């Protein structure tokens, strides 16, 4: 009946991935781990419009090399599980370093959406981001938000429903 999609959340540690995951899924959540390791695996889902969205939280990583079991898990999933959409959660207060992962993600031909979190913190720290320039330079859609202050989440949901169609 209801059409489904699979989306993955990935970014550096401490960017608000857990906060965004909870905001998107609420009570619909299973918590376990990846096979044979003590790396936590969070999965949940939300309904938006008439469509259903399975959300997998990938391990927080700084790059997608193979220097850790986390990078391995994350890379294996992105490439071999082929999610309809990778939501790359990026911290606006440390853009440069967050974008290292982003570049690798683009390399892999991930269907990508950029969630530029912590806009409040950046503003309060005097950090300026030209979101439009960023969107332009990367050729990826950028959704500014502040998940901890419950701002932009709805915007994000909408952008997700739109971005998954870009896998076709
Ligand atoms: N200022 C601010 N803090 C945030 C935001 N989102 C998350 N945080 C805080 O950043 C810290 C780490 O967030 P968390 O979701 O646990 O990050 P994760 O490690 O990427 O999963 C927590 O203290 C959050 O409250 C935001 O939009 N603005």
Swiss-Prot record:
GTP 4 binds at residues 117-120. GTP 2 binds at residues 36-40. GTP 5 binds at residues 146-148. Residues 4-166 form the FeoB-type G domain. It is found in: Cell membrane. GTP 3 binds at residues 57-60. Mg(2+) 1 binds at residues 22-23, 25. Mg(2+) 2 binds at residues 22, 25-26. The crystallized N-terminal domain is a homodimer. Probable transporter of a GTP-driven Fe(2+) uptake system, might be able to transport Fe(2+) into or out of the cell. Belongs to the TRAFAC class TrmE-Era-EngA-EngB-Septin-like GTPase superfamily. FeoB GTPase (TC 9.A.8) family. The G protein domain (about resides 1-184) binds GDP faster and with higher affinity than GTP and releases GTP much faster than GDP. Release of bound nucleotide causes a rearrangement of GTP-binding domain G5, which may transmit information about the nucleotide-bound state from the G-domain to the transmembrane region of FeoB and effect Fe(2+) transport. This is Fe(2+) transporter FeoB. The chain holds residues 1 to 167 of 668 of the full protein.
């Amino acid at each position: 009946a209801m059409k489904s999609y699979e989306i993955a959340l990935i970014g550096n540690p401490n960017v608000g991935k857990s906060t965004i995951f909870n905001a998107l899924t609420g009570e619909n959540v299973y918590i376990g781990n990846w096979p044979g390791v003590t790396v936590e695996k969070k999965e949940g889902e939300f309904e938006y419009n008439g469509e259903k969205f399975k959300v997998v939280d990938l391990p927080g990583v700084y790059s997608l090399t193979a220097n850790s079991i986390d990078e391995i898990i994350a890379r294996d999933y992105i490439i071999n599980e082929k999610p309809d959409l990778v939501v790359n959660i990026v911290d606006a207060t440390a853009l440069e370093r967050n974008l290292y992962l982003t570049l690798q993600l683009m390399e892999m031909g991930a269907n990508l959406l950029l969630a530029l979190n912590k806009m409040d913190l950046a503003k309060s720290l005097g950090i300026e981001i030209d979101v439009d320039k960023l969107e332009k330079i990367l050729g990826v859609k950028v959704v500014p938000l502040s998940a901890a202050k419950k701002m932009g989440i709805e915007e994000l949901k909408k952008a997700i429903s739109i971005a998954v169609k870009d896998k076709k």
